[PDB]
Amino acid sequence: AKVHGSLARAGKVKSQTPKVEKTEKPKKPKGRAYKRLLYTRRFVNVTLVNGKRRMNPGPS
């Protein structure tokens, strides 16, 4: 496929588009802060029905 693009330049003007790909959810905060976001899911809050939990539940 078509790669060359604005990877010719190191970077000056890559893609000058403020057009939304998603609505402030296109990115997981990677690395050290992704284990911040997992400690805050796997231990702060969430369960299904009693303790023996489905961690990826059926949405309901």
Binding site: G31, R32, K35, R36, L38, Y39, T40, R42, F43
Partner: peptide
């Protein structure tokens, strides 16, 4: 392990 990753803030 992941509790340790939480409190002590480790990347891996």
């Amino acid at each position: 392990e992941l509790k340790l990753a939480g409190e002590f803030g480790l990347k891996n």
